[PDB]
Structures are given as C-alpha cells and as structure tokens.
Amino acid sequence: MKYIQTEQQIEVPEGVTVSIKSRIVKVVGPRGTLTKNLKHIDVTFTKVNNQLIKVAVHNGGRKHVAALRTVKSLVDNMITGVTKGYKYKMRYVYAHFPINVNIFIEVRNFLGDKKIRNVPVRDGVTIEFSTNVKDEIVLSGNSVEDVSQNAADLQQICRVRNKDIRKFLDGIYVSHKGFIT
Amino acid sequence: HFKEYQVIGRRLPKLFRMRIFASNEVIAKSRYWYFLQKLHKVKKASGEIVSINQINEAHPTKVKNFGVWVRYDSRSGTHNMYKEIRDVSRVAAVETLYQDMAARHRARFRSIHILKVAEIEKTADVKRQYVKQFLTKDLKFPLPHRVQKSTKTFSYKRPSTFY
Amino acid sequence: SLAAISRAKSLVEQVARDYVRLFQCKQLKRAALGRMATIVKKLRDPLAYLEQVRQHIGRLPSIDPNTRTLLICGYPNVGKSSFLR
Amino acid sequence: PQNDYIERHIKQHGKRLDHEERKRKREARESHKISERAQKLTGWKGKQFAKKRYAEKVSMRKKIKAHEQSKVK
Amino acid sequence: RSKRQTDKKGRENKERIFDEVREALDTYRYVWVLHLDDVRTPVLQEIRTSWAGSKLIMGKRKVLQKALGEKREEEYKENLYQLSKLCSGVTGLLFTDEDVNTVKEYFKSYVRSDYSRPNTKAPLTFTIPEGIVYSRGGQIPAEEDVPMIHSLEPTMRNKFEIPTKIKAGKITIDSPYLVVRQALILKQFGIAASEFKVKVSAYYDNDSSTVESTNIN
RNA sequence: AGAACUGGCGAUGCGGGAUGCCGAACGUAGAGUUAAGGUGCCGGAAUACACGCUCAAGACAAAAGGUGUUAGUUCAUCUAGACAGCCGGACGGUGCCAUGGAAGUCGGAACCGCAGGAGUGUGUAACAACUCACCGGCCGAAUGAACUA
RNA sequence: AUACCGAAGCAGAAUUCGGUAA
C-alpha cells in the first residue's frame, strides 16, 4: 500500500510528564524516571497538548510500521511501569532437595547439586523474598525489560541436567504477574 | 513522451474507430493496423487509413483521477486489468501506467493494449487505496532526508539532509 | 509380526543377492531402492504393533515366580487397595 | 517401573508449572519455523522439505474436501 | 502474505428474524419490551414453558430496529420507533396476549438462581478452607464435598489466579482465599447465590400502541 | 546418427565482448559524425533525469515451498455492524452394542424440539470443567479464501 | 575424529533419532 502517512497516540496520565528530543524517551512520574534510546527506529514525536504525543512515520512500509507500533508499545509499557509499577512473582518447588535461595540472587542445593548458582541483580529491579508464603520470591521494578530478563535468567540458569522432563519437578517458575499498585 | 491520436479505418462502411497512444503518427498507424487484426480480419493492403488526428487535452490544468482499463499479454497469455491513476492529462496518465507495468510486470509498449480511459469526478468511486489516500481534504506531509546535488567535489560543512 | 519381519529380512537378502549376481548405467541403481521400499513400507502395521507392545512390555514389574509370594483376590476396592500399601 | 509410574507421578503432582505456556509458545514459534526453514535448508534438506510440504498441502486439501462432504450429507 | 458441523447463518437468518418480527407485530394481541439481566437457556426455556399464550422473540438488536423502523418518520405504525428504541442490552422482545395485569405479575413472582456478572461483586464472602480444597468449595458441608480433580490445578493457578498446588494428587492452599475472575470463581464452585429476575419496561398494545413504561423486575 | 539444404571461412585485417559472437571488410595523411560496446576507478565518456523493484544476491535450476517483499482477477461479508479481540448461551428427548468404566470427545450405525455437532480438542474410570462452529452484549469498514505476476 | 541442542513411556543406568560440526 505504501502509506503516505501513519501515526498513533499515547495516553499520558496527569501524574507523569514527558519530553522527547532526538528520539530520547524521558518518562518521569511518581515511581521515578526512565529513559530509552530509539534513534535506530527513526520515528518522529510530536506534542499536541502536553497530554498526548504523536508517533508518526512518513513514506514508511510494513517494516517501518512494525517499528513505529513497537515504539508506542514500549512507551506505554514505560508509562505503566513508572505509574503502576510491575511486580513479577516467581515460585519454586522441590521434590526432595530444598532450594535454599539466599542473597545478588543465589540458588543452592538444586537437585542436590553442589555447584552454586547465582544471577546478578540488574538496575531498576528489586528482590524481596516472599513473606509468610513458603518458598516464594517476589520481584518488582519500574523497567519491565530488566525484571523480565532477571526472571528468565533465574528460570533458565537452574534447570534439570538433561534428565527426565516430567519426573524431575524441581525448578523455578513465574507463578503470577501483577502490579505494585 | 507519448501522444494521443485518433485513428479510423474501413478497409476501403462501419468505419472502425479507436484511440491510439504513440510517440508519433507512424507508430500510431502501425499499432492501429496491428489492433485491426485482433479486432477483426483486415490487412494493410485492404484499404487505407481514412483519417488520423492528434487529440490534445481539453484543459491540461486540472488534476483528474483517470480510470484506465488495460489488457496486457503476459508471459502466460493475456489478462484484463483495471487501474486508477491520479494525473493531470491522459498522455501523462498512460505513460505512468506504461512505466509502472514495465517496472513490475515488465510489460512494455509491445505487449500492452489500452482499452478505455475515463475521469472520476466523485470520491469513494476509486477502489484503489494508493489513489484513495490522495482524495481526502487538504493534507500535509514532510519530505524527510532531502539531498542536494553538490557540484563541487569537496565539502567543508558536512551537509545535512534536513528540509 | 515376527514372521513378517523375518520375511522382510529374507526379501532384503534376496534383493542384495540379486544385485550381487552413462544413460544406460544411470538406471542400474534405481531398482534396488524401488524394491526395498516396496518390501519395507508394507510392514508398517506389524511395525506399529511391535512399537505398541514395546511400550507396554518395557515396564513390566518383577513378577518373580521363584521367590515366596502372596496374593490378594476378591471384589475390587473392598479396602484391598490400602492393604498392600 | 510400574505400569503407569510416570503417569502416576504426573497425576500425583501435576505437570510442569510452565509446560502449558511453554508448549503454546513453542507451537507459536513453530508457526513461523515453517517459513523460516524453507528459506535456508539446502540440498537434501530442502529436497525432502519441499516434498513433505507438498504432501501436507495435498493432505490438507483432501481433509478439507472430506469435511465439506460431511456437511452436504 | 504475513496474515493470521455448522455454517455461517448469513443475511438469511437476519431476514428470518425481520419477517418474524413484522408478522408478530400484528399477529399477537399485546407486546412487551424486556431487559432481562442475563441469558440462560434453562431459564429462557422455563419462561417459554411457564405459559402458552406468550412467546419470547430473540434476535439481533439492529435487525429488530430494521423490522420496527430506525426512524419515526418511517415507522409502520404509531409508537413503533419508540418500541424499537426502548429495547437495549439483551435482545429480549416478548409477545403475549394476556392483559397487562396478568403478565406483569409473572416478572415479579418469577426468580431463579444464577451466576454473577462482570463488574459485580460476589453476593457473599465465600472463602475456601485454608487446607485441602474440595470440588464444591470446602466451606460448604464437607460431608458431601469431595476433593478436587488433580488435573485441573493448572487452570485454577492461571485462569483463576488462586495459589493452588497439587500434593499427592490433591490440591491444597495454605491460606483461606476468598471468592471477570469474580464471576468465574463462583461459576467453577457452582455457588449460584445470585438470582435472576427478568425485568420488563413498556407494555405495548398492537392497536392502541400504548407506552406503559415501567421498571418492574 | 547419418541426412537432402541455405548464409559464413579456407586466403581475413580492425573496434567491441578481460580471451575465443556483433559491427565493419583494409593505400599513406589532416579534419568532423558514428556502428557494435560503454560513461564509479583500472578505462577515453554524465556518481545524468524519471517510474518501482531487491537484502542475498547480479553483470544447466523453473518440478515445487516461503508468516520473504509489491501489484491485479473470481466469490463472500456491506454502519440489518467488515475483520481481529474480550464476556455469556452453547439446552431438551439421551439412545442402544463394549457391562467394567464411556454420558459428544477409547471403538460399533446414521434424528431433531426451539444461536447452539447425538460433537473440533483438552481432561476425568466416566460424568465433572474449559473450548470451536454457531450465535448474542461487544467493537466501528474494510475484510476472509484461491488464483494471475 | 569429540562434544553441544530438541524429541522418545528418557524412573536411574543405558539406548535411538533431526541440526551444528572433521
């Protein structure tokens, strides 16, 4: 089709304010601030009334429209994280070898393995062992990408060593996803 | 640079009439003779071209959404095709169609037949989005990444592409 | 199924012994595969049955007749389920 | 060792907590793997893949035709 | 490129409803416009079996609008545009011959148990026991109640979000969890503590075209 | 693998194709225009203009596939609400053989009362529970299937 | 030439298959 013009709109809650120069995101709100570089996408931002930012692409195509829509998706995710804040919950179980998670995140005694597993804490993500709930860890952070990457790394670096995939139930999984608010 | 000519024939009657687009009258006559065989059974020696006259646009100062029906002989037979083109004159509209066909289908003057060209004076009649997008109310769009033909071999300012 | 597998092996040996015994040479090799496929593909049903029985026979318990053994019989689930437990 | 040892354990403790989500995502990725593989596999791999895809297309067409028959009568 | 035992009804079904409404506009003696709170096939069949002189006609709301007229200047009869505009929500349109006094009583006197609906809090503060869960809910008399199936726990932990876990084939929770998830939780346990009472608005006459607007449940 | 024939060498320069068909057939010289073939450098000539294509090509394999990219053809839906996506209805008689459990969903043989299969899958010993296809609250117009290139 | 991935009713041991690679 080769659309001559295409644009989308981003909702801006009163609690947050944004300013974009040279494709630089500056999301500021009650839960802190976040930034991201979108220069490689070559999209254009346009303010209208300090409450809605237009992201538009001219003479683009499906390849460029995909990046344009991804820009809006990332902006919405950043706004939600700065406002509500994401809370990734992860639960771990053990058939016969307790997983003595300890602090930096460390994992011990997985399937009786002597080796110690650990994943460094990333920026913008916090770790809080679940209270009262048995063998549960609750993660939180304004940046969805960092929290999700930390959860994926924790779930991947601790896996069965090429044994039966059904008999061995030990592991760590994302039990629930929610928001801080 | 094509030109529009009206060519008629009658094999020396019904006075068959059709519109031919060619760069010159000589090519127009040849195309008319070729189309005569397809339309009916006639030969060049049968008669003579009764009259050939170039047709100029009534007013080459108005933008018209030309609707064109074109049949072309592809590598696997001939198929009927219809398209709409936004232009100012029929001569330019047909040339644009020829260039588009040569760019995509690689069909050229040899294997392209022009059936009918008619303007569209009402919106929503054009069913092609690439023309429909230009039929809206006065719009505005930029021209990003503009460039300048630097005659000098060397530059000292690091030119910018802004418009 | 065992008889069918034995017959297939015998036919494979027969085909091999038959061969043991440019334009023209190109077609020499085709017949070997063309007939091996005919011999083999038809055994899918016996092979399917063999595979089906393999899973069931690969988990049989240790029903040792020599060692002293005790059995329980009667109407199902009259408390018998927990007796062995 | 029992007749349903793996099934017994699965029923007694359930499947892997992420098996369903991973399986759904694995099938979603396989949905694009069909096109991804056909544009890179060379030689014997491509030769087999083309024939298998043609067979699947023919089988799918026959299945659709049979389904249409079950609706007529 | 790059895209994602019965057949589609098509325009024929819509025309069928249109013709049925057009015929029933004068076939019956009286008409009512309904706003039933929910759709429930057992209840919608009990409403039919409860009487013989009245029938409930259901269809697409916009299809009913065409049959009754989308504009007052094109209505086939007086107050038909008002009748078409009155219908809303569930496309309930009742036809009856009994007088208004007899018909109105059924709506008030008729009520049946039903599940909750989205955007509505649970009718009661039902709580699952802080231990081994049961199919019926657990908090209900445990003598009849039975432990839940082992294979359904993944759906509960995801669709319902409750922190259920399988232990030796039985689901168990460490806390007494309370009750669209609000309606789904009640639906799964079968706790239909809510009730459904079809409400009606303007009673209509096929000749007088009276608009007896009301709101009896 | 012989073959009845029509243009060309043998005796054939020169320009072009890195080198082996196109142009052109030849005295020694000065001046101007071209054929073939070229105009990013080697290489004498415009990193010339205009319409689209292509992410790895580009100066015998085409039998077939691509959720690779861009255009037209047939049918269908038409603000009586296009397509994607949320919530609900998804019922009744009800079924016989396997009897051990099988009630749509392990396997025998194919109705209809009023938007709904005597049933596309998940799953339980089987009911249970979700479901797609079919509709309804739902959204506000292009869209789904196969072909031509 | 050795190993790294995904699958098998692969409980463990142990075995086979599609890709990387000599």
Q: What 3-state DSSP class applies to B138?
A: coil
- CA-closest candidate to residue A152, choices A125, A173, A122: A173
Q: How far is the CA of A163 from the C1' of G20 (A)?
A: 22
Beta bridge partners of A55: A8, A45
**Taking Cα atoms as reference points, which of E165, E158, D14 lies closest to residue A136?**
E165
Same-domain pairing of A46 and A135: no
**Chain E partners of D13 at a C-beta cutoff of 8 Å?**
166-169
Q: Which of D14, D20, D71 sits opposite E166 (nearest CB)?
A: D14
Last residue of a domain, one of A29, A56, A85: A85
Same domain, A96 and A50: no
Phi-psi region of A85 (alpha: psi -120 to 50; beta: other; left: phi over 0): left
Contacts of E158 (CB under 8 A, 6+ apart): D20
CA atoms within 13 A on the CB side of E209: 11
- What is the tally of structural domains in chain A? 2
Q: Which two tokens stand for residue D4?
A: 């349903």
Residues A78 and A160 grouped into a single domain: no
Asked if A167's CB is within 8 angstroms of D17's CB, the reply is: no
CA dihedral A102, A104, A109, A114 (to 10 degrees): -130
Domains of chain B: 1-60 (3.10.20.10), 61-137 (3.10.20.10)
Looking at residue C21, its amino acid is: R
Structural tokens at position E6? 């019965």
Contact A9, A45 (CB under 8 A): no
If asked whether residues A19 and A100 sit together in one domain, one would say no
Q: Provide, as residue numbers in chain A, all residues whose Cβ is less than 8 Å from the Cβ of D9.
A: 166-167
E28: DSSP letter: S
Residue B100 three-state SS: helix
Q: CA A157, A162, A164: angle at the middle one, nearest 5?
A: 115
Helix D19-38 to helix D44-72 angle (10° resolution) is 110
- The coordinates were experimentally obtained by cryo-EM
CA distance A125 to A141: 4
Size of chain C, expressed as the number of residues it contains: 85
Residue B126: how many other CB atoms lie within 10 Å = 19
| DSSP H or E stretch at residue E82 | helix E80-86
- Residue E156 near residue E171, CB atoms below 8 Å: yes
Contact partners of A by the rule of 3+ C-beta pairs under 8 A?
B, D, E
B2-16 b/e with 16+ CB inside 10 Å = b? bbbbebebebeeeeb
Q: Which helix (H) or strand (E) holds B148?
A: none
Q: Which of E108, E107, E103, E100 is nearest to E212 (CA)?
A: E100
Closest CA to E140 of E195, E194, E186: E186
Q: To 10 degrees, what angle do helices C2-20 and C30-41 make?
A: 170
Q: What is the DSSP string of C2-71?
A: HHHHHHHHHHHHHHHHHHH--TTGGGTTHHHHHHHHHHHHTTHHHHHHHHHHHHHHTT-----SSS----
The CATH number that applies at residue A168 is: 3.90.930.12
C-alpha count within 13 angstroms, C-beta hemisphere, residue D34: 11
Domain residues for the domain of A132 are: 86-181
Please give the DSSP secondary-structure letter assigned to residue B68.
Answer: E
Distance CA E101, CA E114 (A): 27
Q: Locate A27 and state its tokens.
A: 């999301």
Do A72 and A136 lie in a common domain? no
**C-alpha–C-alpha distance, residues D40 and D45, integer Å:** 9
Exposure string for C57-77, b = 16+ CB within 10 A, e = fewer: eeeeeeeeeeeeeeeeeeeee
- Beta pairing partners, E6: none
d(CA A57, CA A6): 5
**Residues A92, A80 share a domain:** no
- CB-based contact A180:A86 (threshold 8 Å): yes
Same domain assignment for residues A47 and A62: yes
In this structure, what is the dihedral angle of CA atoms A139, A142, A145, A147, given to the nearest 10 degrees? -10
- Annotated binding-site residues of C for GTP read 74-81
> From the alpha carbon of E5, which nucleotide's C1' atom is closest?
F117
Q: Looking up tokens 């009856």, which residue turns up?
A: E96
Report chain A's terminal Cα–Cα distance, integer Å.
43
Which residue's structure tokens are 């020829």? B98
CA distance E103 to E112: 18
Q: Where does residue C45 rank: exposed (0-12), middle (13-18), buried (19+ CB within 10 A)? A: exposed
How far from the centroid of its chain's Cα atoms is residue B101's Cα?
10
Show binding-site residues of C: 74-81
Task: Identify the domain boundary among A85, A111, A128.
Answer: A85
Q: How far is CA A110 from CA A118, A158, D57, in A?
A: 12, 8, 47
Coil, strand or helix: which one is E195? Answer: strand
> Which residue in chain B has the smallest CA separation from A5?
B141
Contacts of D5 in chain C (CB under 8 A): 59
| Residues E197, A17: Cα–Cα separation, whole Å | 49
Q: Among E56, E63, E57, E58, which residue's Cα sits nearest to residue E10?
A: E63
Q: Are residues A94 and A156 located together in one domain of the fold?
A: yes
Are A160 and A171 in contact, with CB atoms under 8 Å apart? yes
- A163 CB neighbours strand G below 7 A: yes
Q: Is the CB of D4 under 7 A from strand G?
A: yes
* Residues 6 or more apart whose Cβ sits within 8 Å of residue B113: B35, B70, B71, B72, B73, B78
Do residues B113 and B79 touch, judged by C-beta distance below 8 A? no
Rg (Cα) of chain B, in Å, rounded? Answer: 21
Domain end position, chosen among A85, A110, A139 = A85
Q: What tokens does B39 get?
A: 């339309």
- F92 C1' to D65 CA distance, Å: 33
- Look at chain B and count its residues: 163
E153 contacts E165 by C-beta, under 8 angstroms: yes
Q: Which nucleotide is nearest to A165 (CA to C1')?
A: G10
Which residues does A98 contact at the CB level (< 8 Å), separation at least 6?
A109
Cα distance between residue B32 and residue A92, in whole Å: 83
- D31 touches C at CB < 8 Å: no
Q: Which nucleotide lies at the shortest CA–C1' distance from E60?
A: F136
Distance E206 CA to F138 C1' (A): 32
Number of Cβ within 10 Å of residue E31's Cβ equals 21
Shortest CA distance to E201 belongs to which of E41, E51, E85? E85
Instruction: Tell me if chain A has a CB within 8 Å of the CB of B156.
Output: no
Q: Token pair of E139, please?
A: 């908090």
Our CA angle for B81, B83, B89, nearest 5°, is: 130
Whether residues A69 and A50 fall in one domain: yes
Q: CA A158 to CA A174: how far, in whole Å? A: 13
**Pair (A9, A50) in one structural domain:** yes
| Nearest neighbour of E174 by CB, restricted to A62, A93, A134 | A134
Q: What is the DSSP string of chain A?
A: ---SEEEEEEE--TT-B---SSSEEEEEETTEEEEEE-GGGT-EEEESSSSEEEEEEES--HHHHHHHHHHHHHHHHHHHHHHT-EEEEEEEE-SSS----B--EEE--GGG--S-EEEPPPTTEEEEEPSSSTTEEEEEES-HHHHHHHHHHHHHSS---SS-TTT---EEEEEEEEE--
Q: How far is residue E52's CA from residue E95's CA, in Å, rounded to a whole number?
A: 11
If asked whether residues A91 and A112 sit together in one domain, one would say yes
- Spatial distance between the Cα atoms of D60 and D69, rounded to a whole number of angstroms: 14
User: What is the Cα–Cα distance from E101 to E109, expressed in whole angstroms?
Assistant: 13
Cβ atoms of E133 and E177 closer than 8 Å: no
Return the closest-CA partner of residue A11 out of A65, A42, A54, A44.
Answer: A54
Q: Which residue has the tokens 């070729």?
A: B34
Q: Which tokens hold the place of B47?
A: 């008669």
Same domain (yes/no): A10, A20: yes
